[PDB]
DNA sequence: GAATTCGAGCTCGGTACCCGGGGATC
DNA sequence: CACAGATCCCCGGGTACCGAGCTCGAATTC
């Protein structure tokens, strides 16, 4: 078909709608950096950078020809190219195709919708198809490399560690990992701790020997990661940079991640 | 000396010496700021070059011309001056009371002394002879009068003879609250019993009135406002000049005249040089019977035009503040004064009054001599008083009949007169044409809440400010003299801003000469404007036809023209015009206006014939015989007349109204309108036989006469205006709405199929273009209808549209009414009700109220909007795409790619987006305007951008605008400083708080609000081109912003720490390969 | 004990009118 | 003192919702 082509028929689409299920409106005023290896959905909430990768294998058909393209999600500044994948926006939806057609400085992407009928066919809701134009100038700053040490968590675990963290700039927090399983997310007047294995405070992870004590000055982590309603996931630390960053990737239906910048005051 | 005293300075020996201190050249640098002040005791002198003279010394020599004969009583004419006067152009008519005790020694004849015996009113005719002698003829006789109903006065104040009524009117004046009518007797008020008819209705019967001859017409203003306020006075607002013009058939307020032998043999009685009331050469004492109109002469006499321009300096602590007349240190420094000849249009003298030394630059002197213009006579003064006294002495001695200038009523004359009255206490009542007791006054709008204009009334001097003449003959955003000069004269002038005059004036005479050059060049431009437009000739045509003098024509408005024309007609027919206004003083309307049919909005590429009625409402008034005198509200007055044959009957405002027809009583408004419509038709009969530059001026002159024609209608429908009748005005509009619909239904019924069109017009046979025919009105307005002729060729469609229009006008409407095919659009974009663009057949673009023709916007948005509409209309392959846009409903374009032609239509927008951010952005392209249009206190919504900037200008002591000025302003970017300043003078600020003015925003380099200006560029595009998209401004807006290049950055204070954290950038700030290789580095870094 | 929910309320701006005011058009 | 008329679009500023979110707080309810 048309040159770059991303199709989600049913039964792999159900996974992608499930990924967008919790997120609510969060990733609607977003940026969609499509290309090889898939689509990256980037947004800024509260001053932090949140990402949602969507691999090329993770579509019923993903096909790309040309340089990567980047779309604002708000088509005509209200609607959204991801609003299709919402929780209950279109009840009877089955399928979406994203067809891109143009030349490298100017591509446009069109999104058609397909709802189930009886007797195995689909009505195209041509009242609500979307058309976007490739940005025609953009640059994003995506995370890179791999973390220093990453630990997997759960809903109750992650809920309580987010409870431990601060309120405003007065009280900076710190994810130190001590020797032989002293994972700790404290602040002055609240502190929580886990065991790191390679019951109920025994988190699993890898490269657990890599102790530190990271420090954050900006306490928007709680708001940020609560909006996305993360169900517990990876907590990845990145420190071989002048500015350490911590990434958080829910293990629920989605892989929605959020990088938070830990100020340069890195010590063990 | 003179019988009557001369109230102008013929001599002075002490005055108030104000002058800047920098004028005293050899004095230490610290006695230089400020001004001198304080009384000095020497006659005021003037230094013209090397010579020197007293200002007020006429003598033989002189530094400026003089046309005066007397000067402070001395008679400076060659002995044996006695020019014979048989014909005298008259340009102004004064009136002024004259007391027979005051003219004892004046040595008149009996027949004028008895015409002023306690008192009389004297009608002074000012003018020239064919040999250039300034005449002043005094017309004795001519006393005003009003009517009161005989029975009504007989009842409300028991009356048996007229004399008993004269007695009672005297009796009532002698008891007045403050003793203004001392000695008034029963003989100042002669009366008779006349047999007149009120003019409001057909049923009215001719009653018996008393016609009460007042003298000293201010007593008539009392005896009209305070005498028995429950009786109805009829014509007590008609001044003595109008009585003079009308009572004498043939007389005009502007035209040649002639002295006659008179009633028995009585002659013009030439006054003696001492008994002169005016500054004229020869003077006479006539009565109305010694005068004849002398038709056959047309030409204009030798009258003089002064074209002055003052320049002022501010001399306070802040010499960058703008001058203020009340401040004794903000003084006039220069007065340019050009002296043209009005007949030959030849500049005769170029005078420059200058406080202190002024050496005009040689380049300017040589440009003058190169163009043939006189050499500048620079007159130097020491003090401002001497300079202004010499200017007023020139004005009194030369006596220019016409004065002009640019903005001379809002700045120049108010500045000068405020000086001469506040500061120097000079009586201007004698500096006009009368030697004293004349009007020399200015009026400005001053929160009056109706006043249309700031006036000026000097006696015997017609001030035509070219500012007001040009605001109503050219649509410009800015009416500064430089913009007007470029737009009319094609003359890129250099302006000197008042902020740069102190720096210049402080330097030697050579920079003061530079100021004097900019002063002279301003007045030379204004003289060029005056002689391009020649306002005196058009305004005198109007004054001649109306019956008012020329100054009332320039100033008093459209109603007194109609009232005087109607008054002439009424007095002939035996009618009288009641006073109602004598007792008298939100988008609300008085009655129902005209119908505006609903447009089938959109881009119409088929022919659109535009019919419309010629002179619609005047033709209705004439066709249907509408008047006051023909109206009957009650169906009895016409109970002896056939319906439909002797009278029309129409439901107006749900009130049945009977307008009897002519052959029963001719309308008075019909005859009035005849005269004015003939005048307009005569102007239009010279448009096809004139220059292109002359057809444009003639177009504007016929448009002015059109306004006076439509004001006959308008004069009926003015509430609390003179002699209104909203039954006539509402009838006019009711018939207008009926005719618009009658025409639409006729076109829809008769010519629905091509066979019927061909049956009426066989020349349609060669006009059938290939589509399927139809002929549907797709729009209309008060008189026009836009007939979308499908299946017909645009080629001969106007030639048959003329025949259609004659067919319709013959079939439907009465004879004076006439529909006529005036255009044919080969393409039309019916945007909204009063909005459309369209290219007339094989020709010009007509833009009607779509904000390219509106003075709001900035030249940037107008330039790009014009570029877009030119694409739509002229550039084919965008008219194809645009006409293709209608094959889909608008919302389908939100999904589908727009047709492949329209891409260039967004290239313009894209370019404009580029052009709006570019950091040269000369901000004269970004200057919005708005008219003030009322005192800033008379607003209720005081949150307007031009009010914001008005107060910013008054806060900084800059030049505060005037009530109908245009207030230019930029929208500056919202910056934390601007935020703090607005709250200081008290988020996202309003556009009324980001409202700087351009002079400031350049001086202080305040940067423009790119967001606003582009959102309004797209807003103008959306307002126009919503017609392509089903009139959906929403959809249009969305589809236009899809053109614009979208851009995304990680912001600074984010990009900083990312570049610090070893993230490379990929996109703008690197070569394309470098971005690709870094993108490789990232993708393999994540993978 | 503790993952829902949805009442509870609460600030969110799009949308709708409304109004004055500029300034066009008959 | 001063004084033609009306209609009508669009913009700016104001105000009044209210559908939609979306964050705690004691109710269920694992
Ligand atoms: C322009 C204008 C029109 N009108 C009214 C009166 C008109 O009869 C009616 C139609 O307007 P117009 O077409 O503008 O004027 P017109 O048709 O009377 O004159 P013309 O022959 O040049 O076309 O609108 C005014 O009252 N005042 C005006 O200033
Ligand atoms: Mg000036
Ligand atoms: Mg001026
Ligand atoms: Mg007309
Ligand atoms: Mg016409
Ligand atoms: Mg017209």
mmCIF file of N, CA, C and O in Angstrom, chain B residues 263-309:
data_model
loop_
_atom_site.group_PDB
_atom_site.id
_atom_site.type_symbol
_atom_site.label_atom_id
_atom_site.label_comp_id
_atom_site.label_asym_id
_atom_site.label_seq_id
_atom_site.Cartn_x
_atom_site.Cartn_y
_atom_site.Cartn_z
ATOM 1 N N UNK B 263 -35.970 100.558 -5.301
ATOM 2 C CA UNK B 263 -37.420 100.746 -5.220
ATOM 3 C C UNK B 263 -37.936 101.983 -5.951
ATOM 4 O O UNK B 263 -38.756 101.856 -6.867
ATOM 5 N N UNK B 264 -37.485 103.191 -5.566
ATOM 6 C CA UNK B 264 -38.044 104.388 -6.181
ATOM 7 C C UNK B 264 -37.070 105.188 -7.033
ATOM 8 O O UNK B 264 -37.359 105.424 -8.206
ATOM 9 N N UNK B 265 -35.925 105.620 -6.536
ATOM 10 C CA UNK B 265 -34.661 105.416 -7.218
ATOM 11 C C UNK B 265 -33.540 105.049 -6.256
ATOM 12 O O UNK B 265 -32.388 105.345 -6.563
ATOM 13 N N UNK B 266 -33.813 104.480 -5.087
ATOM 14 C CA UNK B 266 -32.830 104.584 -4.015
ATOM 15 C C UNK B 266 -31.596 103.765 -4.342
ATOM 16 O O UNK B 266 -31.708 102.620 -4.764
ATOM 17 N N UNK B 267 -30.412 104.322 -4.058
ATOM 18 C CA UNK B 267 -29.156 103.697 -4.448
ATOM 19 C C UNK B 267 -28.352 103.188 -3.252
ATOM 20 O O UNK B 267 -28.695 103.401 -2.094
ATOM 21 N N UNK B 268 -27.234 102.537 -3.572
ATOM 22 C CA UNK B 268 -26.389 101.828 -2.620
ATOM 23 C C UNK B 268 -25.718 102.686 -1.544
ATOM 24 O O UNK B 268 -25.150 102.098 -0.627
ATOM 25 N N UNK B 269 -25.790 104.013 -1.576
ATOM 26 C CA UNK B 269 -25.222 104.824 -0.493
ATOM 27 C C UNK B 269 -23.825 104.473 0.014
ATOM 28 O O UNK B 269 -23.723 103.834 1.053
ATOM 29 N N UNK B 270 -22.751 104.712 -0.740
ATOM 30 C CA UNK B 270 -21.400 104.329 -0.278
ATOM 31 C C UNK B 270 -20.996 104.961 1.048
ATOM 32 O O UNK B 270 -20.922 106.176 1.183
ATOM 33 N N UNK B 271 -20.732 104.104 2.033
ATOM 34 C CA UNK B 271 -20.325 104.537 3.358
ATOM 35 C C UNK B 271 -19.058 105.354 3.291
ATOM 36 O O UNK B 271 -18.267 105.245 2.355
ATOM 37 N N UNK B 272 -18.829 106.118 4.342
ATOM 38 C CA UNK B 272 -17.683 106.999 4.384
ATOM 39 C C UNK B 272 -16.553 106.267 5.056
ATOM 40 O O UNK B 272 -16.803 105.529 5.995
ATOM 41 N N UNK B 273 -15.296 106.437 4.632
ATOM 42 C CA UNK B 273 -14.223 105.548 5.106
ATOM 43 C C UNK B 273 -14.104 105.367 6.613
ATOM 44 O O UNK B 273 -13.635 104.327 7.070
ATOM 45 N N UNK B 274 -14.634 106.305 7.384
ATOM 46 C CA UNK B 274 -14.647 106.198 8.835
ATOM 47 C C UNK B 274 -15.748 105.285 9.348
ATOM 48 O O UNK B 274 -15.582 104.660 10.392
ATOM 49 N N UNK B 275 -16.880 105.237 8.674
ATOM 50 C CA UNK B 275 -17.996 104.410 9.089
ATOM 51 C C UNK B 275 -17.895 102.959 8.643
ATOM 52 O O UNK B 275 -18.880 102.244 8.759
ATOM 53 N N UNK B 276 -16.740 102.518 8.161
ATOM 54 C CA UNK B 276 -16.504 101.127 7.809
ATOM 55 C C UNK B 276 -16.590 100.205 9.005
ATOM 56 O O UNK B 276 -15.919 100.413 10.014
ATOM 57 N N UNK B 277 -17.394 99.169 8.878
ATOM 58 C CA UNK B 277 -17.456 98.157 9.897
ATOM 59 C C UNK B 277 -16.444 97.067 9.680
ATOM 60 O O UNK B 277 -15.985 96.471 10.647
ATOM 61 N N UNK B 278 -16.131 96.756 8.434
ATOM 62 C CA UNK B 278 -15.191 95.715 8.075
ATOM 63 C C UNK B 278 -13.866 96.300 7.602
ATOM 64 O O UNK B 278 -13.719 97.508 7.424
ATOM 65 N N UNK B 279 -12.921 95.408 7.316
ATOM 66 C CA UNK B 279 -11.567 95.717 6.899
ATOM 67 C C UNK B 279 -11.457 95.860 5.405
ATOM 68 O O UNK B 279 -10.372 95.709 4.845
ATOM 69 N N UNK B 280 -12.573 96.051 4.741
ATOM 70 C CA UNK B 280 -12.728 96.095 3.313
ATOM 71 C C UNK B 280 -12.258 97.423 2.722
ATOM 72 O O UNK B 280 -12.069 98.407 3.417
ATOM 73 N N UNK B 281 -12.114 97.445 1.395
ATOM 74 C CA UNK B 281 -11.688 98.627 0.657
ATOM 75 C C UNK B 281 -12.846 99.602 0.481
ATOM 76 O O UNK B 281 -12.734 100.775 0.827
ATOM 77 N N UNK B 282 -13.952 99.148 -0.069
ATOM 78 C CA UNK B 282 -15.144 99.961 -0.272
ATOM 79 C C UNK B 282 -16.314 99.284 0.434
ATOM 80 O O UNK B 282 -16.322 98.069 0.622
ATOM 81 N N UNK B 283 -17.260 100.090 0.905
ATOM 82 C CA UNK B 283 -18.412 99.613 1.654
ATOM 83 C C UNK B 283 -19.660 100.376 1.263
ATOM 84 O O UNK B 283 -19.604 101.561 0.961
ATOM 85 N N UNK B 284 -20.794 99.684 1.308
ATOM 86 C CA UNK B 284 -22.056 100.222 0.858
ATOM 87 C C UNK B 284 -23.160 99.927 1.848
ATOM 88 O O UNK B 284 -23.035 99.093 2.734
ATOM 89 N N UNK B 285 -24.248 100.655 1.669
ATOM 90 C CA UNK B 285 -25.456 100.597 2.477
ATOM 91 C C UNK B 285 -26.630 100.403 1.544
ATOM 92 O O UNK B 285 -27.113 101.380 0.989
ATOM 93 N N UNK B 286 -27.011 99.186 1.282
ATOM 94 C CA UNK B 286 -28.134 98.919 0.416
ATOM 95 C C UNK B 286 -29.376 98.529 1.223
ATOM 96 O O UNK B 286 -29.420 98.605 2.444
ATOM 97 N N UNK B 287 -30.428 98.194 0.502
ATOM 98 C CA UNK B 287 -31.490 97.361 1.020
ATOM 99 C C UNK B 287 -31.690 96.281 -0.027
ATOM 100 O O UNK B 287 -31.122 96.350 -1.109
ATOM 101 N N UNK B 288 -32.449 95.251 0.308
ATOM 102 C CA UNK B 288 -32.551 94.084 -0.570
ATOM 103 C C UNK B 288 -32.999 94.420 -1.991
ATOM 104 O O UNK B 288 -32.706 93.666 -2.915
ATOM 105 N N UNK B 289 -33.678 95.538 -2.192
ATOM 106 C CA UNK B 289 -34.121 95.936 -3.523
ATOM 107 C C UNK B 289 -33.052 96.612 -4.366
ATOM 108 O O UNK B 289 -33.245 96.718 -5.578
ATOM 109 N N UNK B 290 -31.925 97.039 -3.787
ATOM 110 C CA UNK B 290 -30.790 97.549 -4.552
ATOM 111 C C UNK B 290 -29.857 96.476 -4.988
ATOM 112 O O UNK B 290 -28.719 96.789 -5.307
ATOM 113 N N UNK B 291 -30.279 95.233 -5.009
ATOM 114 C CA UNK B 291 -29.372 94.159 -5.306
ATOM 115 C C UNK B 291 -30.040 93.249 -6.288
ATOM 116 O O UNK B 291 -31.231 92.965 -6.199
ATOM 117 N N UNK B 292 -29.208 92.702 -7.138
ATOM 118 C CA UNK B 292 -29.619 91.840 -8.210
ATOM 119 C C UNK B 292 -28.602 90.742 -8.239
ATOM 120 O O UNK B 292 -27.464 90.931 -7.821
ATOM 121 N N UNK B 293 -29.016 89.610 -8.750
ATOM 122 C CA UNK B 293 -28.175 88.452 -8.625
ATOM 123 C C UNK B 293 -27.068 88.465 -9.635
ATOM 124 O O UNK B 293 -26.024 87.889 -9.388
ATOM 125 N N UNK B 294 -27.259 89.078 -10.791
ATOM 126 C CA UNK B 294 -26.240 89.061 -11.835
ATOM 127 C C UNK B 294 -25.876 87.641 -12.232
ATOM 128 O O UNK B 294 -24.750 87.189 -12.081
ATOM 129 N N UNK B 295 -26.855 86.926 -12.732
ATOM 130 C CA UNK B 295 -26.523 85.658 -13.308
ATOM 131 C C UNK B 295 -25.860 85.886 -14.642
ATOM 132 O O UNK B 295 -25.987 86.943 -15.251
ATOM 133 N N UNK B 296 -25.117 84.886 -15.067
ATOM 134 C CA UNK B 296 -24.342 84.958 -16.284
ATOM 135 C C UNK B 296 -22.866 84.945 -15.962
ATOM 136 O O UNK B 296 -22.086 84.265 -16.631
ATOM 137 N N UNK B 297 -22.467 85.642 -14.902
ATOM 138 C CA UNK B 297 -21.119 85.476 -14.386
ATOM 139 C C UNK B 297 -21.060 84.182 -13.600
ATOM 140 O O UNK B 297 -22.006 83.823 -12.903
ATOM 141 N N UNK B 298 -19.977 83.475 -13.744
ATOM 142 C CA UNK B 298 -19.682 82.312 -12.934
ATOM 143 C C UNK B 298 -18.361 82.405 -12.222
ATOM 144 O O UNK B 298 -18.252 81.971 -11.080
ATOM 145 N N UNK B 299 -17.369 82.979 -12.889
ATOM 146 C CA UNK B 299 -15.985 82.879 -12.479
ATOM 147 C C UNK B 299 -15.800 83.391 -11.067
ATOM 148 O O UNK B 299 -16.618 84.137 -10.537
ATOM 149 N N UNK B 300 -14.761 83.007 -10.505
ATOM 150 C CA UNK B 300 -14.376 83.281 -9.139
ATOM 151 C C UNK B 300 -13.426 84.458 -9.096
ATOM 152 O O UNK B 300 -12.463 84.485 -9.862
ATOM 153 N N UNK B 301 -13.620 85.399 -8.224
ATOM 154 C CA UNK B 301 -12.720 86.536 -8.099
ATOM 155 C C UNK B 301 -11.399 86.144 -7.534
ATOM 156 O O UNK B 301 -11.159 84.985 -7.221
ATOM 157 N N UNK B 302 -10.584 87.102 -7.334
ATOM 158 C CA UNK B 302 -9.177 87.196 -7.055
ATOM 159 C C UNK B 302 -8.872 86.802 -5.585
ATOM 160 O O UNK B 302 -7.814 87.157 -5.148
ATOM 161 N N UNK B 303 -9.832 86.225 -4.860
ATOM 162 C CA UNK B 303 -9.738 85.925 -3.442
ATOM 163 C C UNK B 303 -8.447 85.238 -3.084
ATOM 164 O O UNK B 303 -7.843 84.538 -3.891
ATOM 165 N N UNK B 304 -7.987 85.525 -1.881
ATOM 166 C CA UNK B 304 -6.736 85.024 -1.349
ATOM 167 C C UNK B 304 -6.936 83.867 -0.395
ATOM 168 O O UNK B 304 -7.931 83.776 0.326
ATOM 169 N N UNK B 305 -5.950 82.981 -0.418
ATOM 170 C CA UNK B 305 -5.890 81.811 0.428
ATOM 171 C C UNK B 305 -4.616 81.933 1.240
ATOM 172 O O UNK B 305 -3.547 82.131 0.670
ATOM 173 N N UNK B 306 -4.750 81.941 2.552
ATOM 174 C CA UNK B 306 -3.637 81.680 3.446
ATOM 175 C C UNK B 306 -3.617 80.220 3.842
ATOM 176 O O UNK B 306 -4.634 79.649 4.165
ATOM 177 N N UNK B 307 -2.441 79.632 3.850
ATOM 178 C CA UNK B 307 -2.240 78.235 4.176
ATOM 179 C C UNK B 307 -1.152 78.255 5.232
ATOM 180 O O UNK B 307 0.006 78.425 4.881
ATOM 181 N N UNK B 308 -1.540 78.307 6.503
ATOM 182 C CA UNK B 308 -0.546 78.427 7.561
ATOM 183 C C UNK B 308 -0.292 77.118 8.299
ATOM 184 O O UNK B 308 -1.036 76.150 8.203
ATOM 185 N N UNK B 309 0.787 77.122 9.063
ATOM 186 C CA UNK B 309 1.210 75.965 9.849
ATOM 187 C C UNK B 309 2.119 76.475 10.948
ATOM 188 O O UNK B 309 3.144 77.068 10.642
#
